[PDB]
Design an enzyme around this catalytic site. Structure first.
Site, PDB file in Angstrom:
ATOM      1  N   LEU A  52       2.779  46.881   2.959  1.00  0.00           N
ATOM      2  CA  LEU A  52       2.159  45.649   4.192  1.00  0.00           C
ATOM      3  C   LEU A  52       3.426  45.496   4.977  1.00  0.00           C
ATOM      4  O   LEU A  52       4.437  45.014   4.603  1.00  0.00           O
ATOM      5  CB  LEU A  52       0.864  44.985   3.969  1.00  0.00           C
ATOM      6  N   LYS A  62       6.739  35.733  -4.713  1.00  0.00           N
ATOM      7  CA  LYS A  62       6.092  34.686  -4.635  1.00  0.00           C
ATOM      8  C   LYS A  62       4.493  34.792  -5.598  1.00  0.00           C
ATOM      9  O   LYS A  62       3.807  34.241  -6.014  1.00  0.00           O
ATOM     10  CB  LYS A  62       6.090  33.874  -3.398  1.00  0.00           C
ATOM     11  N   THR A  91       0.597  15.743  11.045  1.00  0.00           N
ATOM     12  CA  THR A  91       0.912  16.449  12.065  1.00  0.00           C
ATOM     13  C   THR A  91      -1.326  17.666  12.559  1.00  0.00           C
ATOM     14  O   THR A  91      -0.782  17.905  13.409  1.00  0.00           O
ATOM     15  CB  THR A  91       1.204  17.840  12.203  1.00  0.00           C
ATOM     16  N   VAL A  93      -3.341  15.349  13.875  1.00  0.00           N
ATOM     17  CA  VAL A  93      -3.357  14.394  14.683  1.00  0.00           C
ATOM     18  C   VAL A  93      -2.873  15.485  15.945  1.00  0.00           C
ATOM     19  O   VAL A  93      -1.604  15.623  16.235  1.00  0.00           O
ATOM     20  CB  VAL A  93      -2.535  12.945  14.729  1.00  0.00           C
ATOM     21  N   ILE A  96       0.190  14.297  17.729  1.00  0.00           N
ATOM     22  CA  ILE A  96       1.071  15.018  16.996  1.00  0.00           C
ATOM     23  C   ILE A  96       1.995  15.921  15.976  1.00  0.00           C
ATOM     24  O   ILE A  96       1.781  16.263  15.848  1.00  0.00           O
ATOM     25  CB  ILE A  96       1.022  13.608  15.402  1.00  0.00           C
ATOM     26  N   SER A 170     -12.847  33.001  22.888  1.00  0.00           N
ATOM     27  CA  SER A 170     -13.724  33.776  21.463  1.00  0.00           C
ATOM     28  C   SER A 170     -14.617  33.346  21.922  1.00  0.00           C
ATOM     29  O   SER A 170     -15.610  34.220  21.881  1.00  0.00           O
ATOM     30  CB  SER A 170     -13.615  32.757  20.651  1.00  0.00           C
ATOM     31  N   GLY A 179     -12.905  27.109  18.608  1.00  0.00           N
ATOM     32  CA  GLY A 179     -12.561  25.961  18.554  1.00  0.00           C
ATOM     33  C   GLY A 179     -12.492  25.056  19.916  1.00  0.00           C
ATOM     34  O   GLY A 179     -12.352  23.512  19.310  1.00  0.00           O
ATOM     35  N   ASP A 182     -12.053  26.699  27.147  1.00  0.00           N
ATOM     36  CA  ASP A 182     -11.092  27.648  27.657  1.00  0.00           C
ATOM     37  C   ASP A 182     -11.650  28.003  29.040  1.00  0.00           C
ATOM     38  O   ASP A 182     -12.540  28.637  29.169  1.00  0.00           O
ATOM     39  CB  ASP A 182     -10.303  28.160  27.518  1.00  0.00           C
TER      40      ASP A 182
HETATM   41 NA    NA Z   1      -0.793  17.907  16.046  1.00  0.00          NA
HETATM   42 NA    NA Z   2       6.329  45.082   3.910  1.00  0.00          NA
END
Ligand code: NA
Ligand code: NA
Ligand SMILES: [Cl-]
Length: 314
Positions: A52, A62, A91, A93, A96, A170, A179, A182
């Site tokens: 892929l 992995k 993060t 938050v 932050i 979206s 989410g 906009d």
């Molecule tokens: Na953040």
């Molecule tokens: Na690949």
DNA sequence: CCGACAGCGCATCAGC
DNA sequence: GCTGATGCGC
DNA sequence: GTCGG
């Protein structure tokens, strides 16, 4: 099918972004997680995934460890690490980032509670992010998005009937949940206090509750439908010149994959598509002056494409 | 081997 | 005080 | 981390 693998890659991605501060490794993992998520077979080996695009040697290795052991030693160690997990969490938050999260953890500030009793160390954005931490992580059902759109379109037209406002993202693509909201905004008197007057009205009717940032062209804030009680939602409003409006709508509607495909196809037809303008390329590659755009369809007609409905832009 | 990997508005810092 | 860099979100 | 010049 491969949720164990994609969660692994997503978890790896976050730690690269938030802890290691390696934004490119973050995107690499996300890209691999994404392409694997669209793969319609249960992966049996790393070598299979290696085929892929976006999956190289390290990720294949992995996956092999994950399929043979059911876990990742590197991940297991990271999860148990107090410093890294605290940085990673902070993060979440809004306001932050990796840098602030690292500073806080260095000072013993590791939890949401620690932030609460250390308000003096937080900027305005971060305090808003702390205040609405839970709400900001919630999705917004389309029905609420529709009610939110009703209020925005109503009040904007109330300020000046010549404004043009489009809820993109979206939601415009027909998603059942979003989410955030906009909004793209334009006015005939603006070409390549208009934004302030719109923001002011929306906070006058108590739709907009807080402000993260606000300038002459871009507003980022918090809003809430009138009432239990609806969660506070993130809302952005961009003021775009009239002649660059529909390139903006096209871009901020997405999706990312669609914008990539449309930009690539535009090149082969001899055009370059920005978020701002569409321009023809000369024989040497010299881009000419921006083409006149008065609708989304005009962009498709420039590059010889059939107008694609927002519903079909994946 | 080694550079690209999006780019910009706004808030706020670092330097002068 | 001003200018440029940085952090952040998107 | 992966792709590609
Ligand atoms: Na953040
Ligand atoms: Na690949
Ligand atoms: Cl341009």
């Amino acid at each position: 099918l491969n949720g164990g693998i994609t969660d692994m890659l997503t978890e790896l991605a976050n730690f690269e972004k938030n802890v290691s501060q390696a934004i490119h490794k973050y995107n690499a993992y996300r890209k691999a997680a994404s392409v694997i998520a669209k793969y319609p077979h249960k992966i049996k080996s790393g070598a299979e995934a290696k085929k892929l695009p976006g999956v190289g040697t390290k990720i294949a290795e992995k996956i092999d460890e994950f399929l043979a052991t059911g876990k990742l030693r590197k991940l297991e160690k990271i999860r148990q690490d107090d410093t890294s997990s605290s940085i990673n969490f902070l993060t979440r938050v809004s306001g932050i980032g990796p840098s602030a999260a690292r500073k806080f953890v260095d000072e013993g500030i590791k939890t949401l509670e620690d932030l609460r009793k250390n308000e003096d160390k937080l900027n305005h954005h971060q305090r808003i992010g702390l205040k609405y931490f839970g709400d900001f992580e919630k999705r917004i059902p389309r029905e609420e998005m529709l009610q939110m759109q009703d209020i925005v379109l109503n009040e904007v037209k109330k300020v000046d009937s010549e404004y043009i406002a489009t809820v993109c993202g979206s939601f415009r693509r027909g998603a059942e949940s979003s989410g955030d909201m906009d909004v793209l905004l334009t006015h005939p008197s603006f070409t390549s206090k208009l934004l302030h007057q719109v923001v002011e009205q929306l906070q006058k009717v108590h739709f907009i509750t807080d402000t993260l940032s606000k300038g002459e062209t871009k507003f980022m804030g918090v809003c809430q439908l009138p009432s239990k009680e609806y969660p506070h939602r993130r809302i952005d409003i961009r003021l775009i010149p009239k002649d660059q409006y529909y390139c903006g709508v096209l871009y901020f509607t997405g999706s990312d994959i669609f914008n990539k495909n449309m930009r690539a196809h535009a090149l082969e037809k001899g055009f370059t598509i920005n978020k701002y303008t569409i321009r023809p390329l000369g024989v040497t590659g010299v881009a000419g002056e921006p083409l006149p755009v008065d609708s989304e369809k005009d962009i498709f007609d420039y590059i010889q494409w059939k107008y694609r409905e927002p519903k079909d832009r994946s």
